[PDB]
Amino acid sequence: AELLDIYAQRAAKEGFAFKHDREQYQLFCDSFPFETTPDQAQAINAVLSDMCQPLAMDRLVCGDVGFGKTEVAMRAAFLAVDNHKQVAVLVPTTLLAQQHYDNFRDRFANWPVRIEMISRFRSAKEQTQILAEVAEGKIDILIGTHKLLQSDVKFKDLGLLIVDEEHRFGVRHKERIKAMRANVDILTLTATPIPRTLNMAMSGMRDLSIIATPPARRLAVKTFVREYDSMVVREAILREILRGGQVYYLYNDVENIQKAAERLAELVPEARIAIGHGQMRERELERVMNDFHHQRFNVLVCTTIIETGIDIPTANTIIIERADHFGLAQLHQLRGRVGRSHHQAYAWLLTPHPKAMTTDAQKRLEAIASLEDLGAGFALATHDLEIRG
DNA sequence: ACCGCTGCAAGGAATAGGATACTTGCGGGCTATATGGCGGCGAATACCC
RNA sequence: GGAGAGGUA
DNA sequence: GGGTATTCGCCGCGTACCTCTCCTAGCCCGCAAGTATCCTATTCCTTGCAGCGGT
Numbered sequence A: 001a002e003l004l005d006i007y008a009q010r011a012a013k014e015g016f017a018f019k020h021d022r023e024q025y026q027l028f029c030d031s032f033p034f035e036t037t038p039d040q041a042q043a044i045n046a047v048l049s050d051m052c053q054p055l056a057m058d059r060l061v062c063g064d065v066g067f068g069k070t071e072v073a074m075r076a077a078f079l080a081v082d083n084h085k086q087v088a089v090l091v092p093t094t095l096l097a098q099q100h101y102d103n104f105r106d107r108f109a110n111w112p113v114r115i116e117m118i119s120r121f122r123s124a125k126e127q128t129q130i131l132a133e134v135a136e137g138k139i140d141i142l143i144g145t146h147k148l149l150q151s152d153v154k155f156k157d158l159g160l161l162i163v164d165e166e167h168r169f170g171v172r173h174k175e176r177i178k179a180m181r182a183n184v185d186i187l188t189l190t191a192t193p194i195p196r197t198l199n200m201a202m203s204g205m206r207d208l209s210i211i212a213t214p215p216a217r218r219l220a221v222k223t224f225v226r227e228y229d230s231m232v233v234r235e236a237i238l239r240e241i242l243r244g245g246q247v248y249y250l251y252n253d254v255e256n257i258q259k260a261a262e263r264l265a266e267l268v269p270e271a272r273i274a275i276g277h278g279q280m281r282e283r284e285l286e287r288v289m290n291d292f293h294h295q296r297f298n299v300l301v302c303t304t305i306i307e308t309g310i311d312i313p314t315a316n317t318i319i320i321e322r323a324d325h326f327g328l329a330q331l332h333q334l335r336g337r338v339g340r341s342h343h344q345a346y347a348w349l350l351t352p353h354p355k356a357m358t359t360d361a362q363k364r365l366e367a368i369a370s371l372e373d374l375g376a377g378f379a380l381a382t383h384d385l386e387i388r389g
Numbered sequence B: 001a002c003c004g005c006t007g008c009a010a011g012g013a014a015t016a017g018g019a020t021a022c023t024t025g026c027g028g029g030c031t032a033t034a035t036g037g038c039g040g041c042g043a044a045t046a047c048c049c
Numbered sequence C: 001g002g003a004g005a006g007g008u009a
Numbered sequence D: 001g002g003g004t005a006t007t008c009g010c011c012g013c014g015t016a017c018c019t020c021t022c023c024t025a026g027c028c029c030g031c032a033a034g035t036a037t038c039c040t041a042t043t044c045c046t047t048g049c050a051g052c053g054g055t
């Protein structure tokens, strides 16, 4: 009955056709100072052909982290601004939202087009101005979190929508963003699908694509599943400090993180530490993110806001503290978030007492330890299927 | 004497764990179709006048 | 209490 | 009617003792036990409205 309200098998849509100029797109390729992997090229060809088709997309590009997936979005946005179709981008954070903001600014500091962000960082006074500008269409590239899906943003011609890290998103988020215009091209970027989406990809009802081709210098990431030792963490911190890198410290607490920062400072007097949590006024958060870009302090304690990831090649090691309750997707994503460089990264994993571990925690840890190699996220997602169900 | 700010609830994503509705085999409690034995004898038909 | 089987004189 | 033959069915078949076993069938409804499921918590994130210093 619900579908009979639409009077179609999800088929009342006619879609849209994009026009691409081969020379213009080739010029944008020239503005990209890199060479894409063959599977990245295949994904580019598939997405460009699909948008050239007069139908709307729902395409999964589920490849492992560190495979330059974002550049596919960069080129999609370039072809969107070629048509001037008011592209919007969604990510469930502010850190990676800022990362995408600056990346798009870099991609379009040569191409005349307007890129901006709308999130908690912006004041409402300028949020209203952003909404007015996107109502008149003077803005083409917007980056922001769920503020857009609050029945407040107005688009003269909403023609392209982008979503990153489909995981951690509840249902009806995609429906709320779809409600505005049916024939918009949906580009679903992600690192790992949740079981339902992966099963639907298997069904073939949604377009799917995989990029099993890592960059040249992306060597593996070492992993070490160890019991709670206060010395391995210190010596690994020193190992990366002598290397000249940044350590990602995970503890997953917003109360004892304060004490833990000074505790690990006493453990490692050589370490310069900043304190990070999502319950902060965000001014010092962006300031210390800038500091991290400058690597003035080495090791950062943080909650799961780090999961989205703005990894710098300088960072080459992650030490966690809680290893009893974390999903396999998160484990693999934070494993692969490190790197983007020629240098061998590391992933030091700290576990509390083995007998305090429940059976499922043992299964998760043994599974993540069993597999350690490139192109491991997709197979890990397949294994997570039949586990989470 | 008006305002933008902080802060304090309401609703999304990840784990453990008891309650409790659901399913099942029973134990006692109850109700309701033959075929290898003769002999004697008296009554009951059959019969053919 | 009643049936069935075997046995003794 | 009547004297007769033929058939049908009922009646009957020793006394005393010892050992052993087994004695209605089937349905049905309460009921004990065992279980899969559903609601109950914890941790993270991003909103929406009421106080509130400050001027």
Ligand SMILES: Nc1ncnc2c1ncn2[C@@H]1O[C@H](COP(=O)(O)OP(=O)(O)O)[C@@H](O)[C@H]1O
Binding pocket: A034, A035, A036, A037, A064, A065, A066, A067, A068, A069, A070, A071, A214, A215, A216, A217, A340
């Ligand atoms: N084929 C390649 N060769 C060398 N470096 C690459 C290649 N593809 C991507 N990179 C680099 O690796 C980084 C990966 O970042 P990102 O696009 O966020 O990857 P992912 O989205 O998979 O995490 C990019 O910033 C880019 O500079």
Ligand code: BEF
Binding pocket: A065, A066, A069, A070, A164, A191, A309
């Ligand atoms: F979206 Be990614 F993994 F940078």
